[PDB]
């Protein structure tokens with residue numbers, strides 16, 4: 001398995017690493033039907049989503065989508081610095097695939 | 104997908120944005136039958152609910168309703184500033200559809 | 207729907223509001239069979255339970271019972287002030303139906 | 310029905326109360342097969358387990374076992390004072406049945 | 413049952429104990445398909461994973477895998493010192509079987 005988020009990200013098509021080294025500036029979450037998702041922003045304006053679960057996802061990803069929204073919420077409320085995000089860049093906002101947190 | 108809570112709220116009928124930019128003043132939750140819900144207030148007297156799950160909800164919303172009560176609870180306890188709420192204004196108290204936190 | 211805990215509490219028989227306006231003094235939780243419950247006390251000696259799930263509860267209350275014990279544990283640990291409890295008083299200790307937190 | 314941990318503990322055979330009145334010294338958890346358990350210790354050297362779910366546990370204890378591991382984790386991290394533990398003493402380490410937390 | 417992480421770790425083949433006595437330096441988690449995992453590192457560079465659930469895990473480990481990612485995230489955020497890790501060393505990064513935390 002990959003040793004880090006950069007190596008993990010490179011295993012997939014349509015991805016890119018974003019290097020933030022900053023806390024989350026805003027956290028949004030919705031329960032509206034067909035938009036059950038989260039959206040975060042950083043102070044520079046860069047915006048990211050956790051996608052609504054769909055036909056593009058395999059079953060194993062469902063629990064991990066729920067965990068990512070948990071992660072983002074707590075990271076936001078603790079002001080944790082996000083180091084990098086691995087995202088799919090074939091969506092807007094870019095869709096989070098993975099996150100790294102470091103000091 | 105929407106970039107922010109205002110654009111997401113605009114996708115639905117019978118909704119509005121409330122701009123609070125304030126922490127939650129009170130948090131209430133109930134396990135009583137047919138009243139399994141949360142209610143929050145702001146110091147200006149605005150009151151909102153997370154509805155009881157029912158027939159107006161699609162299955163994918165169920166997990167999201169539970170997550171939203173989770174979110175409000177921790178927002179309350181951490182005194183996190185709520186920026187905006189997207190609500191259905193066809194219910195009393197207005198029913199939460201999405202939340203944004205910033206600052 | 208109800209706008210506050212007092213109006214909610216009044217929808218049910220065999221309930222009363224207790225006004226605490228205090229943090230929880232003790233939190234006790236059990237996994238022993240037939241006693242899978244939580245008990246909280248306040249420094250005025252008032253004691254309350256989250257009842258073991260049973261045939262008195264409808265299906266939709268199950269998730270909310272588990273949520274209540276999460277709420278009471280985190281309230282305890284954060285020393286959050288509990289404003290009011292809505293309880294069933296046909297049980298000893300009185301059984302929690304709803305909680306409000308403020309101040 | 311019990312109003313406190315001592316009374317609840319007394320309801321079961323092969324149990325005893327340990328009075329700690331201290332925070333947890335160490336918290337251990339495992340995901341290894343057939344050892345999906347938690348172990349806590351105190352600075353006096355007392356060691357306790359949350360048992361692996363098995364055929365001694367009825368269905369309704371399974372959820373409560375999960376919650377107890379949650380509770381011990383967060384108690385540990387917050388340095389909350391543990392007042393008493395109700396344990397089964399026919400297992401080594403003694404097996405937790407209930408916990409009370411108080412200042 | 414085991415009294416500590418060292419005795420638990422010794423019940424399994426292909427395991428070793430790593431003694432860290434330090435907080436986690438970075439936390440990574442992924443929802444990408446077939447890489448639904450967590451990776452942590454320590455300041456000395458040492459890197460560990462929580463494996464993707466697979467056919468080498470029995471059903472009872474599934475829930476504990478979920479729990480371990482929860483634990484590592486909150487450990488990371490609270491800067492909790494990790495005492496020891498029990499890992500399987502037949503994988504790269506070494507795969508976490510158990511964790512102990514102590515100050």
Ligand SMILES: Nc1c(NCCCOCCOCCOCCCNC(=O)c2cc(O[C@H]3O[C@H](CO)[C@H](O)[C@H](O)[C@H]3O)cc([N+](=O)[O-])c2)c(=O)c1=O
Pocket residue numbers: 031032033034035114115116117154159160161164191193194198
């Ligand atoms: N696959 C796929 C897609 N498509 C995904 C589409 C993303 O769409 C979001 C656009 O929003 C839907 C706007 O809906 C109008 C539809 C008619 N539906 C409703 O009437 C309706 C009403 C609602 O309100 C009731 O329920 C609320 C609780 O949900 C609340 O109680 C309110 O008070 C009630 O009146 C709510 C909804 N809802 O959706 O939440 C809908 C794509 O791209 C793909 O590949």
Ligand SMILES: Nc1c(NCCCOCCOCCOCCCNC(=O)c2cc(O[C@H]3O[C@H](CO)[C@H](O)[C@H](O)[C@H]3O)cc([N+](=O)[O-])c2)c(=O)c1=O
Pocket residue numbers: 134135136137138157217218219220257262263264267294296297301
């Ligand atoms: N769809 C829809 C609806 N319907 C929702 C409207 C409901 O509003 C709330 C009004 O509530 C019910 C008032 O209670 C009378 C119900 C008769 N049932 C009971 O007797 C009963 C008894 C209860 O107490 C027992 O259980 C408690 C635990 O639940 C506890 O153990 C206690 O000690 C017991 O005596 C409790 C309930 N209960 O509901 O909680 C009910 C609408 O509008 C739509 O559009």
Ligand SMILES: Nc1c(NCCCOCCOCCOCCCNC(=O)c2cc(O[C@H]3O[C@H](CO)[C@H](O)[C@H](O)[C@H]3O)cc([N+](=O)[O-])c2)c(=O)c1=O
Pocket residue numbers: 237238239240241260320321322323360365366367370397399400404
């Ligand atoms: N509805 C309803 C009721 N009735 C509810 C009754 C309230 O009961 C409270 C006390 O319960 C029974 C005390 O147990 C004696 C009964 C026989 N049970 C056991 O043999 C037994 C043994 C246990 O120990 C084993 O399991 C432990 C884990 O559970 C541990 O591994 C230990 O080492 C083992 O020896 C444990 C239990 N258990 O219940 O936890 C029981 C009412 O009133 C209503 O409305």
Ligand SMILES: Nc1c(NCCCOCCOCCOCCCNC(=O)c2cc(O[C@H]3O[C@H](CO)[C@H](O)[C@H](O)[C@H]3O)cc([N+](=O)[O-])c2)c(=O)c1=O
Pocket residue numbers: 340341342343344363423424425426463468469470473500502503507
């Ligand atoms: N009832 C009851 C019992 N019995 C309870 C048992 C006490 O058990 C602990 C003793 O442990 C036995 C360990 O099993 C070795 C047997 C062979 N099994 C395995 O081959 C095996 C291999 C494992 O490693 C692979 O999977 C790992 C993930 O789980 C990791 O990916 C690794 O890289 C892989 O090589 C792991 C396990 N596992 O069990 O975790 C087992 C009692 O008492 C009662 O009352």
Ligand SMILES: Nc1c(NCCCOCCOCCOCCCNC(=O)c2cc(O[C@H]3O[C@H](CO)[C@H](O)[C@H](O)[C@H]3O)cc([N+](=O)[O-])c2)c(=O)c1=O
Pocket residue numbers: 011012013014051056057058061088090091095443444445446447466
């Ligand atoms: N057993 C076992 C294994 N198996 C584990 C393999 C480890 O592999 C990781 C490398 O991953 C596969 C790279 O995939 C390319 C192949 C085709 N797959 C895709 O088409 C694909 C596309 C995806 O993007 C869509 O879905 C995204 C959400 O998942 C997002 O919405 C994006 O916008 C969409 O385009 C995503 C995936 N996905 O897998 O996440 C795949 C081993 O080793 C053993 O021992």
